[PDB]
Amino acid sequence: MNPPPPETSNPNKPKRQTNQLQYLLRVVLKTLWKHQFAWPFQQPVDAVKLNLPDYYKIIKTPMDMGTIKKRLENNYYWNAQECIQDFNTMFTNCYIYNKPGDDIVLMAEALEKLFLQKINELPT
Numbered sequence: 001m002n003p004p005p006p007e008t009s010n011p012n013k014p015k016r017q018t019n020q021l022q023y024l025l026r027v028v029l030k031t032l033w034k035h036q037f038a039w040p041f042q043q044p045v046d047a048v049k050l051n052l053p054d055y056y057k058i059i060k061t062p063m064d065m066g067t068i069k070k071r072l073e074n075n076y077y078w079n080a081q082e083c084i085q086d087f088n089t090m091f092t093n094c095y096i097y098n099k100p101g102d103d104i105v106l107m108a109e110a111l112e113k114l115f116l117q118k119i120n121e122l123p124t
């Protein structure tokens, strides 16, 4: 079975909106979402659908852009670093679960480089 997906809301966690968090949704995530290699990362890994029964035996902190998008829409984050940390978890999950040079890793690496370019300059 799949685990429950990561939370996209939490009433105990304080919310915030910042210029940088608004940018991470409307520019960074919105652009990455349209990349031709974005599709494996637009929702939590469905280990049942994708026939990856070992995925959550290996990956204990799952993250994906669908979850990040909902968190940004929820104002779930306190600051941009918290959101950037989720992107980095998503990329590292792929590199942990898979081997260097695998097709899915090549996809993640293309997105990671675009991600790095986009957050190189954030609004003030």
Ligand SMILES: Nc1cc(-n2ccnc2)c2c(F)ccc(O)c2n1
Pocket (backbone or CB within 6 Å): 040, 041, 045, 050, 052, 093, 094, 097, 098, 104
């Ligand atoms: N080895 C794989 C295979 C995946 N996949 C792709 C199509 N069908 C299975 C996959 C994935 F969607 C998302 C994240 C991953 O890390 C994946 N890793």
